[PDB]
Ligand binder design. Sequence first.
Ligand SMILES: CCCCCCCCCCCCCCCC(=O)O
Length: 133
Amino acid sequence: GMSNKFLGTWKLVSSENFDDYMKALGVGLATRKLGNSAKPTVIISKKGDIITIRTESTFKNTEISFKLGQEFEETTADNRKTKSIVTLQRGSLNQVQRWDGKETTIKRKLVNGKMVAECKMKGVVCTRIYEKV
Ligand SMILES: CCCCCCCCCCCCCCCC(=O)O
């Protein structure tokens, strides 16, 4: 299953193209400004076969709990109500969110002890790097 090397608390240290990513999602300007300013913390944890990914920022906190490969209801930070599935592919945690006939993917993998999130919406690709705290 998911490597335990994912487990822990992670701090955003880099973001690239997040603004176009948020635009692609339909996020408005004032909200994009706060999203570009945010340096969130991501806490990954597990209890049994339930994985929890919690995101904490001054603007918005979010949290999802799921079992691999089982679709669940998610409320995103920009308040989309999505049906989502997290899968494991070559050590990459891959989240797909679907709503209103659209789809975005967030792929999280470990690289030299950092966590790299790649976010994809309509060909826009955003890259966010996190360091373990
Ligand atoms: C990310 C929380 C704070 C900013 C909230 C602004 C609303 C836009 C959210 C878009 C989806 C966020 C995807 C984040 C991917 C990651 O975990 O790095």
